[PDB]
Each structure stands twice: as structure tokens, then as C-alpha cells.
Design a protein around this ligand. Structure first.
Ligand SMILES: N#Cc1n[nH]c2ccccc12
Ligand SMILES: [Cl-]
Length: 115
């Protein structure tokens, strides 16, 4: 079901290395619906190449646009298993501290602050 389940650590690492080679300016992001989520839809894909200059505030706007949400639907985004300390941080900076050992940045979204 989940990304880490579908691919070996060997496969996730080699993929990140290919994104480095072929999309050197992109952050490799895994974005997944909270497995308890009732309200929000599932995304059409799992793996996203985010321009390394966008801040977390703008990435939330992008995901809300992809899910085609309206203005009073709630959306909460976890990074590497925990709340974001700030939405103003560039994703280049968030990647360097919150990245996984396979080299992906893992995100999970839900309609409640309680995941
Ligand atoms: N970069 C980029 C994105 N392309 N499509 C998206 C959907 C949600 C969040 C980010 C992106
Ligand atoms: Cl690139």
C-alpha cells in the first residue's frame, strides 16, 4: 500500500540518484494520505519533483490546488512524521534536515491536526 512497502531501500535510493542526475534542481517528495483519512481525496500520484526554491506555505497551496479543495476544507501536512515548525522555510533547507536516509522527503496529509 505505502511507498516504502512497494519499493526496496535499494530501489528508493537509486531513484533519488536518477532525480539528482535528471532533475538536479528538484526536491524528491513522497506525499501520502493519512491511512485513517475519511474526508480528503487520494492524490493521482505519490512522487513529486518540487522546485527547491518554493517555501512550505507555497507547497501547501500547490497540494490544495491538486486536491482541488475549497476555502473552508481543512488540510494539515506532516513532514518526516511531525508538524512543520514554520511554513516560511525554503524546501531546499527543509530537505537537508528532514530528508529520509533513502533520500526522499516524506509527507502525510489529513483533515485533522490529530493524525
Ligand atoms: N512541484 C510540484 C507539484 N506538482 N504538482 C503538485 C501537486 C501538489 C503539490 C506540489 C505539486
Ligand atoms: Cl532540474
Amino acid at each position: 500500500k505505502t511507498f516504502k512497502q512497494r519499493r526496496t531501500f535499494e530501489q528508493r535510493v537509486e531513484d533519488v540518484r536518477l532525480i539528482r542526475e535528471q532533475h538536479p534542481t528538484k526536491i524528491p517528495v513522497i506525499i501520502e494520505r493519512y491511512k485513517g483519512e475519511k474526508q480528503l481525496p487520494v492524490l493521482d500520484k505519490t512522487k513529486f519533483l518540487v522546485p527547491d526554491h518554493v517555501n512550505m506555505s507555497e507547497l501547501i497551496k500547490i497540494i490544495r490546488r491538486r486536491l482541488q479543495l475549497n476555502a473552508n476544507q481543512a488540510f494539515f501536512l506532516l513532514v518526516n512524521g511531525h508538524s512543520m515548525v514554520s511554513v516560511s522555510t525554503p524546501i531546499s533547507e527543509v530537505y537537508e534536515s528532514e530528508k529520509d536516509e533513502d533520500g526522499f522527503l516524506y509527507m502525510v496529509y489529513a483533515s485533522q491536526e490529530t493524525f
